[PDB]
Amino acid sequence: MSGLRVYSTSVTGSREIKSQQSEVTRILDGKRIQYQLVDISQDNALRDEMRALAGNPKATPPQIVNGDQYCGDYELFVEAVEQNTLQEFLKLALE
């Protein structure tokens, strides 16, 4: 059983972060995906829970997670669809 929980910021804090979260959900939304959104903006616990499990207190709201592990981030995911690599990060070639 493999799930997908993308992190984001509902309340939003910065003015640029909104541009990132939008681009992320934009692609997924257009793809008509049924993934959840683990927004840390809800509870502060998610903030100190994501940075910990992520092993990096420099990350950002946009973070792709597969269940309970660090799947990727904004740069990665976005850096994939660009060259059509998104699969290598999503399906990882499960043909």
Coordinates of N, CA and C in Angstrom, one line a residue:
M1 N 0.8 -1.2 0.0 CA 0.0 0.0 0.0 C 0.9 1.3 0.0
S2 N 0.8 2.0 -1.1 CA 1.6 3.2 -1.2 C 0.7 4.4 -1.4
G3 N 0.8 5.4 -0.5 CA 0.0 6.6 -0.5 C 0.8 7.8 -0.9
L4 N 0.1 9.0 -1.0 CA 0.8 10.2 -1.4 C 0.2 11.4 -0.6
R5 N 1.0 12.0 0.2 CA 0.6 13.2 1.0 C 1.5 14.4 0.7
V6 N 1.0 15.3 -0.1 CA 1.7 16.5 -0.5 C 1.5 17.6 0.6
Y7 N 2.6 18.2 1.0 CA 2.6 19.2 2.1 C 2.4 20.6 1.4
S8 N 1.7 21.4 2.2 CA 1.4 22.8 1.7 C 1.1 23.7 2.8
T9 N 0.8 25.0 2.5 CA 0.4 26.0 3.5 C -0.9 26.7 3.2
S10 N -2.0 26.3 3.8 CA -3.3 26.9 3.6 C -3.3 28.4 3.9
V11 N -3.0 28.7 5.2 CA -3.0 30.1 5.7 C -1.9 30.9 4.9
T12 N -0.9 30.2 4.5 CA 0.2 30.8 3.8 C 0.9 31.9 4.6
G13 N 2.2 32.0 4.5 CA 3.0 32.9 5.2 C 3.7 34.0 4.4
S14 N 4.4 33.5 3.4 CA 5.2 34.4 2.5 C 4.3 34.8 1.3
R15 N 4.9 35.5 0.4 CA 4.2 36.0 -0.8 C 4.6 35.2 -2.1
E16 N 5.7 34.5 -1.9 CA 6.3 33.7 -3.0 C 5.9 32.2 -2.9
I17 N 5.7 31.8 -1.6 CA 5.3 30.4 -1.3 C 4.0 30.1 -2.0
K18 N 3.1 31.1 -2.2 CA 1.9 30.9 -2.8 C 2.1 30.5 -4.3
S19 N 3.1 31.0 -4.9 CA 3.4 30.8 -6.3 C 3.9 29.3 -6.5
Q20 N 4.6 28.8 -5.5 CA 5.1 27.4 -5.5 C 4.0 26.4 -5.3
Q21 N 3.2 26.6 -4.2 CA 2.1 25.7 -3.9 C 1.1 25.6 -5.0
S22 N 0.9 26.7 -5.7 CA 0.0 26.8 -6.8 C 0.5 26.0 -8.0
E23 N 1.7 26.1 -8.4 CA 2.3 25.4 -9.5 C 2.2 23.9 -9.2
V24 N 2.4 23.5 -8.0 CA 2.4 22.1 -7.6 C 1.0 21.5 -7.8
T25 N 0.0 22.1 -7.0 CA -1.4 21.6 -7.1 C -1.9 21.8 -8.5
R26 N -1.4 22.8 -9.2 CA -1.8 23.1 -10.6 C -1.7 21.8 -11.5
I27 N -0.4 21.3 -11.5 CA -0.1 20.1 -12.3 C -1.0 18.9 -11.9
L28 N -0.9 18.7 -10.6 CA -1.7 17.5 -10.0 C -3.2 17.7 -10.3
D29 N -3.7 18.9 -10.1 CA -5.1 19.2 -10.3 C -5.5 18.9 -11.8
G30 N -4.7 19.5 -12.7 CA -5.0 19.3 -14.1 C -4.9 17.8 -14.5
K31 N -4.1 17.0 -13.8 CA -4.0 15.6 -14.0 C -5.2 14.8 -13.5
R32 N -6.0 15.5 -12.7 CA -7.2 14.9 -12.1 C -6.8 13.8 -11.1
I33 N -5.9 14.1 -10.3 CA -5.4 13.2 -9.3 C -6.3 13.2 -8.0
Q34 N -6.2 12.2 -7.2 CA -7.0 12.1 -6.0 C -6.1 12.0 -4.8
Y35 N -5.0 12.8 -4.8 CA -4.1 12.8 -3.7 C -4.5 13.8 -2.6
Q36 N -4.1 13.5 -1.4 CA -4.4 14.4 -0.2 C -3.4 15.5 -0.1
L37 N -3.6 16.4 0.9 CA -2.8 17.5 1.1 C -2.5 17.8 2.5
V38 N -1.3 17.3 3.0 CA -0.9 17.4 4.4 C -0.4 18.8 4.6
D39 N -1.3 19.8 4.8 CA -0.9 21.2 5.0 C -0.5 21.4 6.5
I40 N 0.7 21.8 6.7 CA 1.2 22.0 8.0 C 0.7 23.3 8.6
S41 N 0.1 24.2 7.8 CA -0.5 25.4 8.3 C -1.6 25.2 9.3
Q42 N -2.2 24.0 9.2 CA -3.3 23.6 10.1 C -2.8 23.6 11.5
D43 N -2.0 22.7 11.8 CA -1.4 22.6 13.2 C 0.1 22.8 13.2
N44 N 0.6 23.5 14.2 CA 2.0 23.7 14.3 C 2.8 22.4 14.5
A45 N 2.1 21.4 15.0 CA 2.8 20.1 15.1 C 3.3 19.5 13.8
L46 N 2.5 19.8 12.7 CA 2.9 19.3 11.4 C 4.2 20.0 10.9
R47 N 4.4 21.3 11.4 CA 5.6 22.0 11.0 C 6.8 21.4 11.6
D48 N 6.8 21.1 12.9 CA 7.9 20.4 13.6 C 7.9 18.9 13.4
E49 N 6.9 18.4 12.7 CA 6.8 17.0 12.4 C 7.3 16.7 11.0
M50 N 7.2 17.7 10.1 CA 7.6 17.5 8.7 C 9.1 17.8 8.6
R51 N 9.6 18.9 9.3 CA 11.0 19.3 9.3 C 11.8 18.2 9.9
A52 N 11.3 17.5 10.9 CA 12.0 16.4 11.5 C 12.1 15.2 10.7
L53 N 10.9 14.6 10.2 CA 10.9 13.5 9.4 C 11.6 13.7 8.1
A54 N 11.6 15.0 7.6 CA 12.2 15.4 6.4 C 13.8 15.4 6.5
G55 N 14.2 15.5 7.8 CA 15.7 15.6 8.0 C 16.3 16.8 7.4
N56 N 15.6 18.0 7.6 CA 16.1 19.3 7.1 C 15.2 20.4 7.5
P57 N 15.6 21.3 8.3 CA 14.8 22.4 8.8 C 14.9 23.6 7.9
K58 N 15.2 23.4 6.6 CA 15.3 24.4 5.6 C 14.3 24.2 4.5
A59 N 13.7 23.0 4.5 CA 12.7 22.7 3.4 C 11.6 23.8 3.4
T60 N 10.5 23.5 2.7 CA 9.4 24.4 2.5 C 8.1 23.6 2.5
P61 N 6.9 24.4 2.6 CA 5.6 23.7 2.6 C 5.4 22.7 1.6
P62 N 5.8 22.9 0.3 CA 5.7 22.0 -0.8 C 6.7 20.8 -0.6
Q63 N 6.2 19.6 -0.2 CA 7.0 18.4 -0.1 C 6.2 17.2 -0.4
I64 N 6.7 16.4 -1.3 CA 6.0 15.1 -1.7 C 6.5 14.0 -0.8
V65 N 5.5 13.3 -0.1 CA 5.8 12.2 0.8 C 4.9 11.0 0.4
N66 N 5.6 9.8 0.4 CA 4.9 8.6 0.1 C 4.7 7.7 1.3
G67 N 3.6 8.1 2.1 CA 3.3 7.3 3.3 C 3.9 7.9 4.5
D68 N 5.2 7.6 4.8 CA 5.9 8.1 6.0 C 7.4 8.3 5.7
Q69 N 7.7 8.7 4.4 CA 9.1 8.9 4.1 C 9.2 10.1 3.1
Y70 N 10.4 10.6 3.0 CA 10.7 11.7 2.1 C 10.7 11.3 0.7
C71 N 9.7 11.6 0.0 CA 9.6 11.3 -1.5 C 10.3 12.3 -2.3
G72 N 10.1 13.6 -2.0 CA 10.7 14.6 -2.8 C 10.3 16.0 -2.3
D73 N 10.6 17.0 -3.2 CA 10.2 18.4 -2.9 C 9.7 19.1 -4.1
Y74 N 9.6 20.4 -4.1 CA 9.1 21.2 -5.2 C 10.0 21.1 -6.4
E75 N 11.3 21.4 -6.1 CA 12.3 21.4 -7.2 C 12.3 20.0 -7.9
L76 N 12.4 18.9 -7.2 CA 12.4 17.6 -7.7 C 11.2 17.4 -8.6
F77 N 10.0 17.3 -8.0 CA 8.8 17.1 -8.8 C 8.7 18.0 -10.0
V78 N 8.9 19.3 -9.8 CA 8.8 20.2 -10.9 C 10.0 20.0 -11.9
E79 N 11.1 19.6 -11.4 CA 12.3 19.3 -12.3 C 12.1 18.0 -13.1
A80 N 11.0 17.3 -12.8 CA 10.8 16.0 -13.5 C 9.8 16.2 -14.6
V81 N 8.6 16.7 -14.4 CA 7.6 17.0 -15.4 C 8.2 17.8 -16.6
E82 N 9.2 18.6 -16.3 CA 9.8 19.5 -17.3 C 10.4 18.6 -18.4
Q83 N 11.2 17.6 -18.0 CA 11.8 16.7 -19.0 C 11.0 15.4 -19.2
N84 N 9.8 15.4 -18.6 CA 9.0 14.2 -18.6 C 9.5 13.1 -17.7
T85 N 10.3 13.5 -16.7 CA 10.8 12.6 -15.8 C 9.9 12.3 -14.7
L86 N 8.9 13.2 -14.5 CA 7.9 13.1 -13.4 C 7.6 11.6 -13.1
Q87 N 7.5 10.8 -14.1 CA 7.2 9.3 -13.9 C 8.2 8.7 -13.0
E88 N 9.5 8.9 -13.4 CA 10.6 8.3 -12.6 C 10.5 8.7 -11.1
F89 N 9.7 9.7 -10.9 CA 9.5 10.2 -9.5 C 8.1 9.7 -9.0
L90 N 7.2 9.5 -9.9 CA 5.8 9.1 -9.6 C 5.7 7.6 -9.7
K91 N 5.7 7.1 -10.9 CA 5.6 5.7 -11.2 C 6.9 4.9 -11.1
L92 N 8.0 5.7 -11.3 CA 9.4 5.1 -11.2 C 9.5 4.0 -12.2
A93 N 8.8 4.0 -13.3 CA 8.8 3.0 -14.3 C 8.4 1.6 -13.7
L94 N 7.1 1.6 -13.4 CA 6.5 0.3 -12.9 C 5.8 -0.5 -14.0
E95 N 6.3 -0.4 -15.2 CA 5.8 -1.1 -16.3 C 6.0 -2.6 -16.2

